[PDB]
Write a protein that binds this ligand. Structure first.
Ligand SMILES: [Zn+2]
Lengths: 72, 61, 68, 317, 175, 189, 135
């Protein structure tokens, strides 16, 4: 089967990012991509929005793996 | 049920290609009934196995 | 069709007086079917009885034969 | 309560009633069985190591040749009996001893030596009734050469049987040639004259040491019949077989191959994988081509006299 | 309590007295049975007791003390107690072909081989174990291992050399 | 104290099986700061049970062809993998590692016995060191399979196997392969 | 229906184990022998003439008659074990030795094992030729 993710957010999909995602206990661009039908660049950048909002902590950042968490 | 073992002696190495190891086995319910077994892989003196049967008889096919 | 052992009977063999044991086994006999008598069909059988099955202090490499 | 290597070979763990247990350090290091060293690991903390004195040792050896056992005992077997001597001089009354005890009092019978005198399953009832294998101050020795020297002093000892000893039933070998009794049952050639004129002699020893010996007066044993035959030329080489005259003439090294010498340990259940349900027979080596056999195998043909009616197609060794 | 008895010949007497620990111990311990040798009848005779566990602990004990009487080795007879189906087939060496004189004694020479080499071979390749009495051939193995132990034995003692026998075993041993 | 990665401790880590206890490393004096140690652990036999089992998970993760010498690549895959375990479970991930190892190595295996052309396996026993060796291999291999051609990371997909085996769940790869080798063995007996 | 006998007292029978080279018979009779109780042939069980003299066919016959023996009150057996004898082979085969061990465990009290094989003192001509036959 084909996997056609979105490239920019939808009104509903940006809500799932804002509301659901900061309560996962494990937030990662691969995970967000897997649960929301979103390409890796968009989901990788959306987590940088959610650091700017302060909604989400930061555990580790690397070339290939960046790991985020629910808020405390 | 599932028992344990104690390697008392390594007696030899059996199998087609020299693969399995023929090993003198003590139990760990400290019963002096040494049912003697064949293992797969490296085993030295003093190891401890994990059986699913202790009903293996000295029988030839 | 016919289960024949319902048509049987059961007699006892009893040794003569030289021996300690007398009742030494059973013997199957078909009943009188009108014509042939059940005692008639028994009247000549032989019994390959050993020695210690007859006299108790004895070594049984010997045998005896006995007619009903 | 002097401990011996045979007590641990039969594993007589009886350090509970007799509590004066003394032993020799050598007679536990000479044991080649690993289950005895397993016995040495835990239990023998109740006993004590001790050696006897050279005054005591020589006086044991005096009546040892007078009871005719000094070559029959081992060297370590000498010191254990001298180790009992210091214990008896220490604890027990020495006034109840004897030495140079008694004569032979030959009880000549018409019983053949090879008759089953008190072999357990043999009966002339006496069953086995599977409990009796375990029913088959002092000492615990199972060697009769050890047990002979004790009771001639009048020294009651015990065994794995917790009761004391009163009856000693065994067999010795007297030279029919030079009249020399040894307690060894293993050797077949004499120790004084070196012939094959050892004959089986049954003994019966009491606790006091009443030596009375059934010399088998029966001419089937007293027989010169199968005793003269011509011998081949003396042969020297790697594969010569001289017909076993002396106990020590240099035989060439003839040995079985170790893939033929070993039998099946068919008891062991690590057994299923691989080969045939029997041992593989050795058809490849030159141990098999020279027809090298076991020294114990074929012994019944040794008992056959040479000048007899062998079948016309046999050839032995 | 039921019992079995079994005789002995005179050349098989002295093997019992040499082996009365080794025939002794596994019958009495591993099966819980009682064992005697009646010297007034010279028979080996075992019976059950209360410690006898298995119903056929006696039956496979009789065959063990039968095979030792038939000349088999002690250890190689022990597996009759243990393995479920070992058997024995006995022969008259003249039941295949009427040999006599020295033609009888050359059947023994072929079926034994020089140094036992032919007997040692057929045991290896047919998964059996055999013992030659004079007119008697006793084999011990599994049934199909027996059925192709007789044929290597039968075909030695009707003329063929051992090499034609050695070849013709392994064409059947492939199956 | 000697923390693995400077943040994970060893004294919490508790071994269940006595069978595996002498053949699974770090508890107390094996405790080292990094998996990377580079010692001669295959110099002779039974020396690779004394090396830390995080380094064992390392050396079996560089294993494939394109990755076949790159150890610093791998101790980075390990380091990011424990911190995904901790954020999904909260447990000391070394305990999750050991509970995933123990549940993974099979306990009876089949073995071919007989002549050539004849396939009749018989079940034999599995050695304790081999059960360690079989488990790590079955753990690392499951990280390749669900992460060879998708977005998920191998520092991530390792931590999804290494959790699903400490559950002994059916979702792990190393559990289905234990549920086959030890299923086939009990039809060989 | 049958022997109204107390339980410590056995009701003996006689079992005839006839061996051949093609099959084996198991044949449970009276102590006289004139009536048999049940005859289960060894080639009644296996439907393969190749396997008609099997130890396995011997087990299947003897279990199906000790079923019938115990059905009819016979608790014990004296066994007349038998070869084919005469001209041909004298010693009963393993297919006879199998069925013996078969109904030993099947709950039959086995008493005397008897070797009734037809042995000649001095017989007629062997069926094989002068040359021999495969056996
Ligand atoms: Zn002398």
């Amino acid at each position: 089967d084909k996997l056609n993710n979105l490239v920019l957010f939808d009104k509903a999909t940006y809500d799932k990012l804002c509301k659901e995602v900061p309560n996962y206990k494990l937030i990662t661009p691969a995970v967000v991509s897997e649960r929301l039908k979103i390409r890796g660049s968009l989901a990788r950048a959306a987590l940088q929005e959610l650091l700017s909002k302060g909604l989400i902590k930061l555990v580790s950042k690397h070339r290939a793996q960046v790991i985020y968490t629910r808020n405390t | 049920p599932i028992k344990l073992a104690r390697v008392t002696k390594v007696l030899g190495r059996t199998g087609s290609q020299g693969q399995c190891t023929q090993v003198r086995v003590e139990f760990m319910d400290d019963t002096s009934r040494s049912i003697i077994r064949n293992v797969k892989g490296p085993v030295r003196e003093g190891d401890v196995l994990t059986l699913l049967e202790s009903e293996r008889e000295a029988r030839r096919l | 069709v016919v289960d024949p052992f319902s048509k049987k009977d059961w007699y006892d063999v009893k040794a003569p007086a030289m021996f300690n044991i007398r009742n030494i086994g059973k013997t199957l006999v078909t009943r009188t079917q009108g014509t042939k008598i059940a005692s008639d069909g028994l009247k000549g059988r032989v019994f390959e009885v050993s020695l210690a099955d007859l006299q108790n202090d004895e070594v049984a490499f010997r045998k005896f034969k006995l007619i009903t | 309560v002097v401990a011996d290597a045979g007590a641990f070979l039969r594993h007589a763990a009886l350090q509970d009633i007799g509590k004066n247990i003394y032993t020799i350090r050598e007679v536990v290091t000479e044991i080649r069985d690993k289950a005895t060293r397993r016995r040495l690991a835990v239990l023998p903390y109740e006993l004590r190591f001790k050696e006897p004195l050279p005054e005591y040792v020589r006086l044991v050896t005096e009546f040892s040749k007078k009871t005719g056992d000094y070559p029959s005992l081992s060297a370590t077997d000498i010191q254990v009996l001298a180790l009992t001597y210091q214990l008896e001089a220490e604890f027990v009354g020495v006034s109840h001893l004897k030495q140079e005890p008694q004569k032979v009092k030959v009880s000549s019978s018409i019983q053949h030596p090879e008759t089953p005198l008190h072999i357990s399953g043999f009966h002339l009832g006496g069953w086995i009734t599977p409990s009796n294998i375990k029913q088959i101050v002092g000492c615990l020795t199972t060697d009769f050469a050890m047990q002979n020297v004790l009771l001639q002093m009048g020294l009651h000892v015990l065994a794995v049987n917790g009761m004391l000893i009163r009856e000693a039933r065994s067999y010795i070998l007297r030279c029919h040639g030079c009249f020399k009794t040894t307690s060894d049952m293993s050797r077949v050639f004499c120790s004084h004259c070196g012939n094959k004129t050892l004959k089986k002699v049954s003994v019966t020893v009491s606790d006091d040491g009443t030596l009375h010996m059934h010399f088998s007066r029966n001419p089937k044993v007293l027989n010169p019949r199968g005793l003269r035959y011509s011998l081949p030329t003396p042969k020297g080489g790697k594969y010569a077989i001289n017909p076993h005259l002396t106990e020590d003439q240099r035989f060439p090294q003839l040995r079985l191959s170790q893939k033929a010498r070993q039998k099946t340990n068919v008891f062991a259940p690590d057994y299923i994988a691989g080969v045939s349900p029997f041992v593989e027979n050795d058809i490849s080596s030159r141990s098999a081509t020279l027809q090298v056999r076991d020294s114990t195998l074929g012994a019944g043909r040794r008992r056959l006299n040479p000048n007899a009616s062998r079948k016309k197609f046999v050839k032995k060794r | 309590e039921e019992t079995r008895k079994i005789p002995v010949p005179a050349n098989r007497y002295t093997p019992l007295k040499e082996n009365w620990m080794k025939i002794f111990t596994p019958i009495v311990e591993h099966l819980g049975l009682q064992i005697r040798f009646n010297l007034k009848s010279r028979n080996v005779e075992i019976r059950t007791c209360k410690e006898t566990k298995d119903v056929s602990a006696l039956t496979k004990a009789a065959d063990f003390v039968k095979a030792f009487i038939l000349g088999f080795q002690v250890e190689d007879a022990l597996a009759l107690i243990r393995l479920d189906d070992l058997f024995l087939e006995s022969f008259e060496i003249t039941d295949v072909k009427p040999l006599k004189g020295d033609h009888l004694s050359r059947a023994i020479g072929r079926i034994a081989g020089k140094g036992g080499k032919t007997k040692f071979t057929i045991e290896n390749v047919t998964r059996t174990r055999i013992v030659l009495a004079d007119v008697k051939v006793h084999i011990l193995g599994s049934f199909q291992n027996i059925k192709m132990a007789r044929t290597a034995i039968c075909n030695l003692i009707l003329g063929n050399p051992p090499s034609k026998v050695y070849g013709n075993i392994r064409a059947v041993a492939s199956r | 104290d000697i923390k693995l990665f400077g943040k994970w401790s060893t004294d919490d880590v508790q071994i269940n099986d006595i069978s595996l206890q002498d053949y699974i490393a770090v508890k107390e004096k094996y405790a080292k700061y990094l998996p990377h140690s580079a010692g001669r652990y295959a110099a002779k036999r039974f020396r690779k049970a004394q090396c830390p089992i995080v380094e064992r998970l390392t050396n079996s993760m560089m294993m494939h062809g394109r990755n076949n010498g790159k150890k610093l690549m791998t101790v980075r895959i390990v380091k990011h993998a424990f911190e995904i375990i901790h954020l999904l479970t909260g447990e000391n991930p070394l305990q999750v590692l050991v509970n995933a190892i123990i549940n993974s190595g099979p306990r009876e295996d089949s073995t071919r016995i007989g002549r050539a052309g004849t396939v009749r396996r018989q079940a034999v026993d599995v050695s304790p060191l081999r059960r360690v060796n079989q488990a790590i291999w079955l753990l690392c291999t499951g990280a390749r399979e669900a992460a060879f051609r998708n977005i998920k990371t191998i520092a991530e997909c390792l931590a999804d196997e290494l959790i699903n085996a400490a559950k002994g769940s059916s979702n792990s790869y190393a559990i289905k392969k234990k549920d086959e080798l030890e299923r086939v063995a009990k039809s060989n007996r | 229906l049958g022997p109204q006998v107390a339980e410590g007292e056995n009701v003996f029978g006689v079992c005839h184990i006839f061996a051949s080279f093609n099959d084996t018979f198991v044949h449970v009779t009276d102590l006289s022998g004139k009536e048999t109780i049940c005859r289960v042939t060894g080639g009644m069980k296996v439907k393969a003439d190749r396997d008609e003299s099997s130890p396995y066919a011997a087990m299947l016959a003897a279990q199906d008659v000790a079923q019938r023996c115990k059905e009819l009150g016979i608790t014990a057996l004296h066994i007349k074990l038998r070869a084919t004898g005469g001209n041909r082979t004298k010693t009963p085969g393993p297919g006879a030795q199998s069925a013996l061990r078969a109904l030993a465990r099947s709950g039959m009290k086995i008493g005397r094992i008897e070797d009734v094989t037809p042995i000649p003192s001095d017989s007629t001509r062997r069926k094989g030729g002068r040359r021999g036959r495969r056996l």
